[PDB]
């Protein structure tokens, strides 16, 4: 996260860290046994880390659970990043409490102008690389579709939306991918991509979760 602030230990209880010997992507806990992340984050040998703040120190409240299976959307296209969504089933159910809780799926899509909270352990610099120890947060509004398509001509599908600041300086970045975009208590987006980080006229692009609620429910129901 570039231009954000320190969230505060366990203030984003649904935030998850995908680990394979190091942190590589974020995710959101949607129920005691399922995590939602980005398809481009897929890799074998994933360990889901819950209740984390400082990802480099065991401070208590952490729960490390191996992924039993990862389900990348069947129509995911790595070239365009369309349908950048993946479901992860935990080997065992997580222990829900105040520091570890699930986030609700949306019943309808969010409107432009809606303020959301984006979080993650990604790069905090728009120039070089600087990874934080603790979880970073950023409040950002959903942009209009025309503004989004104007910024990224020919690269925005109906399954994506822009969020952030056209003035640059505040954005999500590498390492934040797969993470949550929560608006009004509902998971509306997944950190997917952008051109560089926090650059002028190049906001972040996110997977439009409201377009996948039926797929998520049907997939979870049969697995
Ligand atoms: N600004 C952000 N919110 C953000 C978030 C996560 C990232 O990892 C990056 C860094 N990222 C991710 C890739 C992007 N590279 S690129 O501009 O060549 C593009 C490649 C590509 N492939 C398919 C569709 C569209 C494109 S744009 C970049 O800087 C940026
Ligand atoms: Ca820790």
Curated annotation (Swiss-Prot):
Gene3D superfamilies named among the record's database cross-references: Trypsin-like serine proteases
Cofactor(s) essential for the protein: Ca(2+)
Binding, Ca(2+): 52, 54, 57, 62
Residue span, Peptidase S1 domain: 1-221
Similarity comment text for this entry: Belongs to the peptidase S1 family.
Protein name: Serine protease 1
One GO BP annotation of this record: proteolysis
Cofactor note: Binds 1 Ca(2+) ion per subunit.
Activation/inhibition comment: Is inhibited by scorpion cyclotide trypsin inhibitor TopI1.
Leading EC class: hydrolase
Annotated disulfide bonds: 7-137, 25-41, 109-210, 116-183, 148-162, 173-197
Top-level taxonomy: Eukaryota, Metazoa, Chordata, Craniata, Vertebrata
Active site per UniProt: 40 (charge relay system), 84 (charge relay system), 177 (charge relay system)
